[PDB]
Amino acid sequence: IKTTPYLEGDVLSSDSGPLLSVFALQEIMQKVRQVQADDVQKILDDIKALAAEQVYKIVKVPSISFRHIVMQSRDRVLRVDTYYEEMSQVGDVITEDEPEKFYSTIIKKVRFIRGKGSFILHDIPTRDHRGMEVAEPEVLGVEFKNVLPVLTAEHRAMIQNALDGSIIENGNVATRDVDVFIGACSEPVYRIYNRLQGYIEAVQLQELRNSIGWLERLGHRKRITYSQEVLTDFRRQDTIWVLALQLPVNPQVVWDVPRSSIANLIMNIATCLPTGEYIAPNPRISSITLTQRITTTGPFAILTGSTPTAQQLNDVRKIYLALMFPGQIILDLKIDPGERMDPAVRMVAGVVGHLLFTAGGRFTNLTQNMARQLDIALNDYLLYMYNTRVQVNYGPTGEPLDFQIGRNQYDCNVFRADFATGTGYNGWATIDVEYREPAPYVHAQRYIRYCGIDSRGIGMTYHCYNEMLRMLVAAGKDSEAAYFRSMLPFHMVRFARINQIINEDLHSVFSLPDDMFNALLPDLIAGAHQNADPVVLDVSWISLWFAFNRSFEPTHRNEMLEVAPLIESVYASELSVMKVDMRHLSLMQRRFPDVLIQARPSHFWKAVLNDSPEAVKAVMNLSHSHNFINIRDMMRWVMLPSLQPSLKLALEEEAWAAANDFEDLMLTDQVYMHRDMLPEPRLDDIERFRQEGFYYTNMLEAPPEIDRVVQYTYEIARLQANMGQFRAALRRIMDDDDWVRFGGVLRTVRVKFYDARPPDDVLQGLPFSYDTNERGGLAYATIKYATETTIFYLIYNVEFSNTPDSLVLINPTYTMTKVFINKRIVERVRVGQILAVLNRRFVAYKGKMRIMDITQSLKMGT
Amino acid sequence: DHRGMEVAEPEVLGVEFKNVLPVLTAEHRAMIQNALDGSIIENGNVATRD
Structure with missing residues (x-):
């Protein structure tokens, strides 16, 4: 199937051009840019990547959580945990002038702690020793290699045997045999690990079967294109299921977001709209000789024989998209002062838009202005007389169609536009919406049928078309009477195809709710839209004629359709996470x-929307750029009760619960100032410096005095x-030699280790910035109250005593701000209890277990 | 934003007083600043517009 040709400048062509979905994206984005004005493939695969989002990181070996530093001794070494280092380095600068920056940095901290907390073990390495299975040293949470050569005496033997004694344990948890041992791990990430393992040991196979049943229900509704089930192979006992998502999503949470009509429409376009071709009622008729096609004289005869170009093709597909989306797309004319053309094109457009568009009833597709213009154009046509002169009987007013015509007086005043019933369009005394059976989506019960016909018809007519032919035979325009009488079946089949496209392909969670669809028109006639907002698009004149002489035929289905429930469920889970994050921000604020x-x-x-998936950010930004909100909407939406439970939600809540101590988030206010002469090694006698060494830090081990x-x-x-x-x-x-405190706000503190003399900025920086603006x-x-501040640990390399050019501070200097912290970080501890961190119970699964999740593994689609 | 409430900049107010800043004392300038920053902006509706 190839589309009927359309002329390109001077040479005919038949290229389909870009896909209809891409066209709809670009048209909507350009329109909203024009609205605000005083990337389609990127946004499309941004939507696509929501499917491959994964919450838990499957890993071979747990991350190392400790490391050691040795200084020329046998008894004691320094230990440090890398968790605080990684959490401190992921921060951002804070000013109280920008609470949005403040809370975005807080959100980044909490998202980091959750992402670092979520992981699980699958296939850890095992070794053998005298018939007992032991874990290898590298799977432990503590890594040490430097301590082995420097240590001597029996200490090496008594740490080696203790390391070797890390025997595995066998136990019978609900999934039968697993591996149990002891390890070392920092606190909050292991709380998240415990929460994840507690979720995993819970069993919800019945919920899985319910999800499977809902999938098959939706599949047999979408039996035209949906057929996917791999159920027969799942049932092996040597397996683990992880249900990180509940598949039967609730549409109420996704429709509760204020001013999300534009985002829901654009996501429907992204995931459901098909691609088609535009075909004439009779193919190849454009290439026959023109003398055959232009049979006689008249407006319709002059109009026939014209060929469209790219502008009219784009306007025709705009018209078809408006037909495909009745409740969100409205149309108006592209009127400019530079127009000049024969009146016949506007005349025919007014004649044909009455049959093409529908108005009144329960849904409308036109503005009042456009309906008025079409009506006055048809008035002009009915008064246009060039073959035969007939009697006319006008009415009391100058309203269009306020007259009686024909040998028998037949009233044409009915076709004047009235949105109460829709007398002049396809909503005239004919049913358009109905209900058959309970839908899988509980907010989209309606069936939308054009011209009252159903897909499950040759020669059938309808009321509006029959009365249009009555008007035309009363007007005595028998040429176009026969023309339309012959052209009926093309119209009927095209509208049946469109009917099929709405009633079958577009059924998704993002469809407009039934009450809002019913209340769209009363809001339109009232003029104030307290609830939802449609969008209006401009379309030219001959686009109507070319739309009537073209059709739509689908050729390629939407690729997104297979994983659409999955992506929309991920979207709902993310939205619930943002809602609960807002809630807990308010709670911590109080x-x-x-x-x-x-x-x-x-x-x-x-602040919450700052850290979010990119597609969600883009669609919310476009929706809010099109239509605005205020504080009342936020306070209303944060108080709505409904939530979408998920593993992501549970991990977020547990992350906040473990992060309740905000001091643990590497945020504090205990910065002080007291001049101290910067300690330096004497560097005079080589041997004693080599034996002694030196290290220093600006850490306050104890809080300063009240006085x-x-x-x-x-x-x-x-x-x-x-x-x-x-x-x-x-x-x-x-000079009075006192401490000074910079309390009142939370400051971000970095941490850094140095094996040499650092630059002067981190040696002697200030907590603030001081800029003297112009006189x-x-x-x-x-004063900028808060700036970059760094706690630092300096430990010189004693080998560098050969080349003191990199270690001598040239001139003695003063040190600057001190920092007080309560959590233990860097400790000089004796070598015996270096293993005293091995205190948390690690559990791992057997290698032969298969731990895939069927819902995510179903995305292949073959 | 002052303390989290919306306040207009001191230039939109039709008063010129830059010439008397250096002659006031600490307490006088403190109370002048305290009186000035309290002029919050209130939300309102005019002809169904915000």
């Missing part, structure tokens, strides 16, 4: 008022900066 910075629901929504300390809140800092005595006050009060200003020099 929990800590004295140090957190007050924000609004708009700031909270932006001999002053505090600086942000408001006092700002007032002192505008005073201009800020530097003088600091210099005086710290004559209102506020004078300004």
Whole structure:
């Protein structure tokens, strides 16, 4: 099948061009850009990638959570856990001027802790020792290699045998034989691991069967194109199922989001719209000789024989998309002052739009202005007389069609547009919507049928067409009477095909709810849309004629259709996660008022939407750019009860519960200032320095005293900066040799280790920035209260004593801000209890177990 | 945004006082700033518009 030819500039062509879905994406995006104005493949595969989203990371060996540093000794070494390092380095700079940045950084912290927490063990390595199975050293949570050569005496033997004694244990959990042993792991990630294992040991095979049944129900509804079941091979006992998602999604949560009509429409386009070709009623009639086609004289005769170009092709597919989506797409004319053409084209458009479009009844496809223009055009046609002069009997007013025509007085005033019943269009006294059986989606019960016909017809007519022929035979225009009488079947089959496309392919969770579809028209006639918003598109004049003389024939189905329930369920789960994140942000905000910075629901929504899948971000951004919201919508939407439970939701809630101690999130306010002369090695006698070594840090091991300390809140800092005595006050009060505190807000602290002398910035930075704006200003020099601050551990390489050029600080200097923390991080501990972290119960599955999830593995589609 | 509430910049107010900033004391400038920053912006409706 190839589309009928359309002329390209000067040469005919028959190329189908870009896909209809891509065209719809670009048209909607360009329209909303025009709306705001005062990437289609990227967004499409951005939608696609939602399917391959995976929540848990299957791993061979758990990540190393500890490491060691040795300094020229046998008794004690430093131990450090890499969890705090990784959590501290993933942060961002904080200013209280930008609560959106503040809460986006908090959200990044919580998302990092969840993602690092979710993992599981499958195929850990095993070794043998005297008939007892032992775990190899590399699967442990603690890695040490440097301590082995430096250690001596029997300590090496008594750590080697303790390492060897890490025997495996066999136990009978509900999935029969597994492997149990002991390991070392930092706290919050292992709390997440415990939560995940507790979910995994729960059994929901009945829920799996319910999901399977819903899939088969939807499949036999979509029996035209959906046929996929691999059920026969799943039933092996040597397997594990992971149900990270519940498949029977609830459409209420996805339709509760304010002003999401545009996003739902664009996602329906993304995942359901098919691709077709445009065919004439009779193929190849365009290539016959023109003298045959232009038979006689008249407006219709002049119009016939014309050929369309790319502009009219695009407008015709725009018209067809409007037909495919009645409740969201409305049309109007593209009127410009530069128009000039023969009136016949507008005349025919007014004649034919009455049959082509539907209005009144329960749904409308046109604006009042467009219906009025079509009506006045048909008035012009009915008054246009060029063969025969007939009697006319006008009415009291100058309204269009307010007259009586024909040898018998037959009223044409009915076709004047009225949205109450739709007398002039295909909603005139004919049913269009009905109900047959309960749908798999509980909000889309309706069946939408065009011209009252059903797919499950030769020569059948309908009321509007019969009355149009009555009008035309009363007007005595027998040429086009016979023309339309012959052209009936093409119209009927095209509308049957369109009917099939809506009633079969488009059934998804994103379809408009029945009550809102019924209430669309009353909102349109009222003029105030408190509930939902459709979109209007512009279309030219001859596009109507060419739409009537073309059709739509599907050729390639939507690729997204196979995994559409999966992607929409992932979307719902993500949306629920954002909702609960907003909730818990508000709860923590009430929990800590004295140090957190007050924000609004708009700031909270932006912060939560900042960290989100890219396709979801794009569709929300487009929807909100088209239509706006306020604080009332956010406070209303955060109070709605419905939620979509998921493993992602459970992990998010457990991550927040383990992150309740915000001090553990590498966020604090215990930064202080006291000058200390920077310690340096004496570097005089080689042997004693080689034996001793030196390390230093700006860590406060203990909190400072209640006295001999002053505090600086942000408001006092700002007032002192505008005073201009800020530097003088600091210099005086710290010549007084006192501590000074920068409390009031949360500061992000980085951590770094150094084996040499670092640059002066991290040696002696300040907690703030101080910029002196130009003289004559209102506020004078300004203070940025919070900037980059780093806790550092310096441990020199004692070998570098040969080349002191990289270690000597040239001139003695003062050290700067100190940091106080409560959590244990870097510890000089004796070598005996280096293994005292081996305290948490690791569990692993057997190698022969097959742990695939059937719902995600079903995506292959072959 | 001050303390999380929306306040307009001091220039939109039709008062010019830049010439008397350096002559006031600490307390006087403190109370002037405290009085100024409290002028919040309120949301309202005019002809069904926000």
